[PDB]
């Protein structure tokens, strides 16, 4: 029932250095865990960087070095690349058993910050004709890539009925996600104004739609 | 060299099971520690368990207890996973990886399998339907929504192709068995409504086409 926790997210710049960090909820991270770091690319392409706490897998660079800082263990990039942009797994072992991080998703900022280009589109009358309601809430453009998205009906928030597809990435290197709210027609027609917010980078974009 | 072949993806009903596989190749088979890891969209990697190819000595999360069972045959150099009674909690990406020589000191998770997008339905080849999405009101950005179709995946262009940059497909949804995904595309303000944008939808599962104007709301 142990909690692996990483930093959700990080940014930082070509050049620079970053360190992730992987908190156990047992307690302090020792060797006696032989903390793995392992990174995930796009096209769940897997690679392993560092076992044993700090032994580098063979052709990895040297960039990368696994550490223990205080009571947790820690992966650092020192000259941080664009190749390095990805999802960080570590995973610690504890008495013949291995738990994963839920990973941070790094960013090594290859262009300037983007912010998503939000639309929302309301339900076609033919979906409402089913008795159906789907509000359609396209992001685009967005660097880094990582965002959460919110929606609100006359001024209250929703947990009911929302999915948000995973940030992808565009061919410009930027990405790109969508975000649904399917709602009953009759439900739709009983409120008056819908919204879809998407955070980014400590500010947010909102766009919302009054119902004609 | 190393390799790791799991079939790519596979269909199960909800209440069945699954024998998933990973073919090792490059390497001796019974000398390293195979894992299974589950994951879902967006989400963390889960440990399930692990299998010794060389010894059955195996060792399963607490979480996956009653749901996995790893096995190995090692003269076709596989390992198996075989999942139980299944429900949606178990749609996911699942990867077999190589660990090391030893528990846990001298190695890494230095190769992992494809993985396999196990996904659990209901729903038999079903069509898509599609909605035009117009504005609610520079530049203008319209759509259309491709929903309650089964299987994966569709094909969704714009003016048959015609107009290209600006379009935008994201990824499918998987909603009470059923998928659904949205594309949109960016035009002029101007040139529509004047001229016509119309998504062409078409799905190859159930050999089905829709095209779809979208006019002004």
């Known amino acids: 029932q142990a909690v692996v926790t990483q930093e959700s997210a990080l940014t930082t710049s070509p050049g620079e250095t970053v360190t992730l960090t992987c908190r156990s909820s047992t307690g302090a991270v020792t060797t006696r865990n032989y903390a793995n770091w392992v990174q995930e690319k796009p096209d769940h392409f897997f690679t392993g960087l560092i076992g044993?706490?700090?032994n580098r897998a063979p052709g990895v660079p040297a960039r990368f070095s696994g550490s223990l800082i205080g009571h947790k263990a820690a992966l650092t990039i020192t000259g941080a690349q664009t190749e390095d942009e990805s999802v960080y797994f570590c995973?610690?072992?504890?008495?013949?058993?291995?738990?994963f991080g839920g990973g941070t998703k790094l960013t090594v900022l290859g262009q300037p910050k983007s912010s998503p280009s939000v639309t929302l589109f309301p339900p076609s009358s033919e979906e409402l004709e089913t008795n159906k309601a789907t509000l359609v809430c396209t992001i685009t453009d967005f660097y880094p890539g990582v965002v959460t998205v919110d929606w609100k009906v006359d001024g209250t928030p929703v947990t009911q009925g929302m999915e948000t597809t995973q940030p992808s990435k565009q061919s410009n290197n930027k990405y790109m996600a969508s975000s649904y709210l399917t709602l009953t027609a009759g439900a739709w027609e009983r409120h008056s104004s819908y919204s879809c917010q998407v955070t980014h980078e400590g500010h947010t974009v909102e766009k919302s739609l009054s119902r004609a | 060299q190393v390799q790791l072949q799991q079939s790519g993806s596979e269909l199960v009903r909800p209440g069945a099971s699954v024998k998933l596989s990973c073919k090792a190749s490059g390497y001796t088979f019974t000398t390293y520690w195979i894992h299974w890891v589950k994951q879902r969209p967006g989400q963390g990697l889960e440990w399930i368990g692990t299998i010794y190819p060389g010894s059955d000595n195996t060792y399963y999360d607490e979480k996956f207890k009653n749901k996995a069972t790893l096995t190995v045959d090692t003269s076709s150099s596989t390992a198996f996973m075989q999942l139980s009674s299944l429900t949606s909690e178990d749609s996911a990406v699942y990867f077999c990886?190589?660990?090391?020589?030893?528990?846990?000191?001298?190695?890494?998770?230095?190769?992992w399998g494809q993985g396999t997008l196990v996904t659990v339905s209901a729903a038999k080849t079903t069509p898509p339907s599609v909605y035009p999405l117009a504005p609610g009101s520079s530049m203008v950005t319209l759509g259309c929504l491709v929903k309650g179709y089964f299987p994966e995946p569709v094909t969704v262009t714009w003016n048959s192709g015609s107009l290209s940059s600006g379009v935008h497909t994201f990824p499918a949804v998987l909603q009470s068995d059923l998928y659904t995904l949205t594309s949109s595309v960016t035009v002029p303000s101007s040139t529509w409504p004047s001229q016509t944008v119309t998504c062409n939808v078409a799905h190859p599962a159930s050999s089905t086409k829709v095209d779809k104007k979208i006019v002004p709301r």
């Open positions: 990886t190589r660990g090391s020589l030893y528990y846990n000191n001298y190695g890494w998770f230095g190769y």
């Open positions: 995973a610690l072992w504890y008495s013949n058993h291995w738990v």
């Open positions: 044993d706490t700090n």
